[PDB]
């Protein structure tokens, strides 16, 4: 028999200067458990890589340095745009194998956002706490940890597809025949979850034929929302700016409005503050302002460094990820998202969203 929730528990970062309190596992505690219980390997992936920026980040890096010195294979995948701190990292840990990744060499837009850990094919973390000293200590984050081996192995297979896009000689990032020979597999998806948990992936050109696109899964859950939509992402402005041009993409932005106007879903949105100089953010703000007064919508903003990417639907489905609901992310970027329908796991997620919705850092949207 399989366990309910796949042995999953919540993990997050609550800085001391912030009023967030919870009994769940902390991000700093989580990484020590992974490194201490590690016996075979430790695979880590994120965009930036800068652990020494805080005290708690430097302690995990020292525990990982000790791990690489005892015979544990340590491989760290970072996007080639976080290559500044590379010489600093290898200078402190020579035994850790750092690898620069460029998943999109066709247009150089897709970035590596896959923010997760995996060790011994038994334990694993996933969330929005990137391998930075801030995301462990000073930046509020949110993730999930599970010591269920079958779940960690299906997350290891996500790591295998990403490692192939290394910038060294002929590989999946250089050759097209070596990129087509990738066993891009997945053990569980929306049509066959494990213990009520499954993974969704991104972008579309890295799914193969078995994996699920996170874009289609999120929109389907938003269009199938009957009661409540609770989102805590950085921003949901349908327009992003790639290079010196703007990219309009309102797929997630419209499916939410379709819920609050046609279906009358009580929707609460907790996004970060925006720039007054950005006409795209201001026009998006003045639009949402007219809906909280007309339909059952509510919007609050925050100014703190927060990477949280949470989506709760009808107290029946929870979606934690590292990418933000926008066009640039769900079209080119590569990451892995957490999906679970376990009522007890979604309940603990609703417990967190309510906490942040009433926190002092969440002031009401004023225009
Ligand atoms: O979302 C609406 N408009 N809107 C966009 O289409 C975006 C584009 C244009 C302006 C900004 C950004 C540059 C991108 C965004 C924005 O606010 C909107 C939704 C519902 C209503 C109604 F109130 F009738 F319910 C009216 C309008």
Residue numbers in the entry: 6 to 372
Sentences from the paper on this structure:
We showed that F13 forms a homodimer on membranes, and tecovirimat inserts into a cavity formed between the two protomers.
In the absence of tecovirimat, sF13A295E formed a homodimer that resembled that of sF13WT, but with the ends of the α10 helix being more open, so that Y285 was hydrogen-bonded with Q299 instead of with N300, as in the wild-type protein. Overall, we concluded that escape mutants isolated from tecovirimat-treated patients alter the dimerization interface of sF13, making tecovirimat-induced dimerization less efficient.
